[PDB]
Symmetry: D2
């Protein structure tokens, strides 16, 4: 186990990547606290992992719930080694032109409150525990944090913003707490949009992501959620990622190195070297 | 005069970088519309520039006030060629540890509303006019949009966030409207912060910070904007990011600059 | 004139972008020295510009010729305000698999000698004059200096390398000489490949660049060479670019902000806002 | 043991970062082939690791020596899963002003030949085996591949150049072979330079330089490579760049780190 005796706090861990993360982290010897708004799914993750997992119902936008999550984690486990702010909301790539005027201000607050403020409240709440442990923060970014076309202006703005927290928090929490970001590509999760845009109940699993991403990713397929948890274990392992603070790992099937006419340069290499 | 017949709309153009831009765009033969919250400072630029300026007293956070900036720019001048969303707010470099739990929620909103939403509203408000003139957007960023230590978590994330609007608005507004970002640093503007809040001077730390070894006057930050607003010079450029901070990101570990003793070394 | 009384030295200025640059710079009040290997084209540029242009035959790979170019510039004009290293060679995007083993080492030296060493020798030679003038260096990069698919490993490596000289030379020549890079996209020039690859006599003007780039650039067309000179005037104007050292201006029709399924997001905006 | 059944080929794996990698990959259950110019140091790792290593004494600049590294890795172990081109040469941070006109031409070649061509030859030599195992390449970069002041013009351009091989080889070797770069800094390796040449210590400047506030042992730089060579953990990642330098690019203007007084501030 890369991670025996380590203690993680993960927000948005009752679905999608945050759940796979929880599963992975427990399989690696860690004990995990989850702050999520989803009551039933938090209990589902608790009964799956038998004491190695604590689940706290609450909102990432409330510092208080976040503080509660920290407190419960400390009460359940003794410490926090790794903070993984992760809970998130999409805009479904609604362009600026298509953001209705009566809806922009509300959509703005909703997406930024979860995506950016939710991250800031995770760090504020866990700060005393992370300095105590010399632990580390790993933020879930996205390809939308580096290149356009992965979300509308709201969402691309929020992910670019977390890159800004990666850097500012690596600076500010040094030398006691390390700060890094993982930037996953498309995932088959239960990612939702905001009420403003009537996307509360739209789920990204309902979008033909696997179909689309086959054409676009150099690596010629969308990874399974299992395969997006590895990078987080890396940053959560003391002995492996000690020299990394400030790090931005693009973890997206190579969206930033794709070609202009094809995603991949070497589909026919095996036969070009004729094996 | 590089911009004769061109019309700009500049938000936060009544003080600091924004005033220097008004003056410069007006001196280049451009006519300028200005949305600023400072009515008295809007007065002064209106007297300064005759009919070559119009101010609208509004808040960059209000989409409607933004609409009136645009519409009044259209009524005065007939078009908008270049939009410079520029209004912004700083956090005094307040470290997360030092943001009070009871202030953090409002202060997040105040800073992100002006700095980010404000930029979004300015574009949204100017979209039909820009697409019509096939114009250009130049957002003002900051060194804090790329490197730590130019603001706390709130400011830095706001300025990283606008790096994102550059790229996504470049993509989205193409092929009609070009979108770029200028990232100034090294200024000593009277950049203030929100009510929510009540950091050693740039002079005190310049040798560890600015390879250029000097503090440029505001007027020296105007040229990049003129360039990105000149269609005959900046046409290839959309999505671009111009670090304009005196070399902050190319500074040395022990000193900002490494060739202080060049003239004496090269016998100059 | 943005540039009255200014003095430029441009390498590779007898063809393609370097020529347009020369033309532009003279139209802007500047006097221009050109180091190029092309004898006849250097004389052609001299007779076009009547005293405002000096041309020196020589190779960018020889420090000596480069020194000669500096000397001639000083003799002709009195000073050097702006150094524009620019001469270059392409690999035509020959993939690693297609670089023959008997040819890699020679192709390596040729492309790196021109693309990177040629730049280093321009700066070494003009250094005394640029400190004297407090002038500035502007390197011609490329999109191949930022993203793949604009050249093979050799060429993408050389352009990434000049990004490295942008940064190291902005640092090292501060506070007396500013250092910046412009990174143009595809251009209809007379860009050649190396002898090793039998590309000496292949010209990029013979590649359907305009056709290809129509699909790929957000801006929906390849710019004319006239329209790639503006950025250089910006960096060559004292009063406009004084706070820029270290700067990297992507100047390529928006290759880094293109979409996954289309280059541009807003082909049908006029009708979306219905004008 | 994270890499049981996996085979790596590591160039410059007989000292510094490369030796730490050999040891670490061997301790993870991997079998390792090593191309290094240092025959005596190749001896020591051969005795250190029993049959779990093989060295070939060669030069990373020679395509043929590279071919024998690969082929001998195949004869010994049957496959290559992970190639770590890692051999490199520094310039002592020799400033351009200080590169002698008579040395500059050779020194350009020596440094670029090992550092860049060497990386190219290693991949080229290992291409049929990597594509066959659907493996991965991890080039060693450097802080000098991103920020100034970790080498003169020659070194820095060499390490920026490898950032380019990452992206172009990611593109070109896809979808079969993933290519990433690790960029270490903050080490105190015995990094030497070319004959052509005959810079204050990291200890002397650490507080302006490393937010982590400490000098990590070599062994602490191995984990990222293990990660990028573990197919079940690093599969999404191709073209990636992992800054692994203690936070050099996220350091402050006046001090590297900004929360030195956190424990006392948070009452820890
Ligand atoms: N899914 C993708 O394509 C993708 C790609 C890149 C990055 N990301 C990022 O991955 C992260 C995880 O999202 P996901 O993709 O697993 O979607 P998901 O909806 O399946 O998981 C996100 C979790 O966030 C929780 N959550 C949302 N708002 C909350 C709130 N206000 N308070 C408490 N909990 C809240 C939800 O209950 C859910 O369990 C987000 O940061 C997302 O932007 C997603
Ligand atoms: N200080 C630096 O070195 C530095 C560096 C990079 C970028 N900047 C940026 O430069 C841009 C211009 O600011 P400045 O530095 O010139 O500071 P400034 O305060 O002198 O100028 C800001 C202007 O914006 C106006 N403004 C502020 N909030 C507003 C609102 N809500 N609605 C309407 N108008 C509003 C102010 O009244 C003022 O006229 C900002 O985006 C700032 O973030 C400053
Ligand atoms: N053309 C493109 O698509 C493109 C795109 C981005 C960047 N660039 C860069 O633009 C620059 C200019 O090249 P171009 O596109 O105008 O091609 P070009 O061949 O038309 O111009 C380049 C000039 O370099 C000169 N030159 C080449 N080798 C030389 C040597 N060893 N010594 C002296 N002079 C030499 C040639 O004579 C020629 O006049 C290069 O740095 C190139 O990589 C080109
Ligand atoms: N010093 C730092 O902080 C730092 C930072 C980032 C990256 N690096 C890089 O780490 C990598 C490993 O180097 P190191 O720092 O461990 O230094 P090192 O000298 O201790 O290791 C280099 C190894 O490469 C071998 N080598 C050198 N030239 C060779 C050649 N031409 N052919 C074959 N083998 C050759 C040497 O014999 C030695 O075993 C290099 O790419 C170096 O550039 C060092
Ligand atoms: O972070 C993200 C979250 C959700 C979707 C995407 C996405 C990207 C490209 C195409 C379609 C969706 C994304 O990047
Ligand atoms: O710098 C460059 C020089 C020559 C060609 C390209 C290019 C890029 C994309 C597609 C085709 C050619 C390039 O980027």
């Amino acid at each position: 186990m890369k991670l025996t005796g380590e203690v993680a706090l993960i927000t948005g861990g009752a679905s999608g990547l945050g759940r796979a993360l929880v599963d992975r982290f427990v399989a690696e010897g860690a004990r995990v606290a989850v702050l999520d708004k989803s009551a039933e799914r938090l209990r589902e993750l608790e009964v799956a992992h038998g004491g190695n997992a604590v689940g706290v119902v609450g909102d990432v936008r409330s510092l208080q719930d976040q503080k509660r999550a920290a407190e419960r984690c400390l009460a359940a486990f003794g410490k926090i080694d790794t903070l993984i702010p992760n809970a998130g909301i999409w805009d479904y790539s609604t362009a600026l032109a298509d953001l209705p005027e009566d809806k922009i201000d509300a959509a703005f607050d909703d997406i930024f409150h979860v995506n950016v403020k939710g991250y800031i409240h995770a760090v504020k709440a866990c700060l005393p525990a992370l300095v105590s442990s010399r632990g580390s923060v790993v933020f879930t970014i996205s390809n939308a944090g580096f290149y356009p076309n992965g979300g509308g202006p709201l969402y691309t703005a929020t992910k670019h913003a977390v890159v800004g927290l990666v850097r500012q928090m690596a600076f500010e929490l040094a030398p006691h707490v390390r700060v890094n970001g993982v930037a996953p590509g498309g995932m088959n999760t239960d990612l939702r949009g905001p009420s403003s845009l009537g996307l509360s109940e739209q789920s990204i699993s309902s979008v033909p992501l696997a179909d689309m991403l086959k054409s676009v990713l150099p690596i010629g397929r969308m990874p399974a959620l299992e395969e997006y948890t590895g990078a987080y274990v890396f940053f959560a392992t003391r002995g492996d990622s000690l020299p990394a603070t400030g790090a931005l790992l693009n973890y997206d099937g190579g969206m930033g190195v794709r070609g202009f006419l094809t995603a991949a340069g070497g589909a026919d290499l095996p036969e070009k070297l004729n094996i």
